[PDB]
């Protein structure tokens, strides 16, 4: 029981909400400290991702 209640689809869904809300938070303290969130991510975009974004 309690996993017959928490069918793992809801667990993956709440993990997705955790990820997106933590992403909002992390962006919020990055521009609160004053750093550029998009430059800090620009250090990590790949070539294929960058071409698709262009």
């Amino acid at each position: 029981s309690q996993r017959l209640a928490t069918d793992p689809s809801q667990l993956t869904a709440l993990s997705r909400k955790h990820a997106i809300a933590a992403h909002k938070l992390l962006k919020a303290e990055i521009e609160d400290a004053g750093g550029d969130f998009e430059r800090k991510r620009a250090w990590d975009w790949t070539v294929e991702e960058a071409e698709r974004w262009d």
Binding site: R41, W43, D44
Partner: protein
């Protein structure tokens, strides 16, 4: 043996994955000044010298 036989430049051993530039930029690992730290020093020097010149005239 892993942490001494890897070069530890792209690999991160505590996370068992690649090293992220989001957390540790290579500008930290640099020994010099970037273009923006530089030229920001130039802006600061310019405004300092302009304030000094105007107070000298006054």
């Amino acid at each position: 043996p892993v942490l001494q036989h890897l070069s530890l430049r792209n690999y991160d051993p505590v996370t068992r994955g690649p090293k992220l530039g989001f957390e540790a930029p290579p500008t930290e690992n640099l020994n010099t000044l970037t273009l923006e730290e530089k030229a920001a020093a130039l802006e600061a020097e310019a405004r300092r010298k302009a304030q000094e010149e105007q107070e000298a005239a006054a």
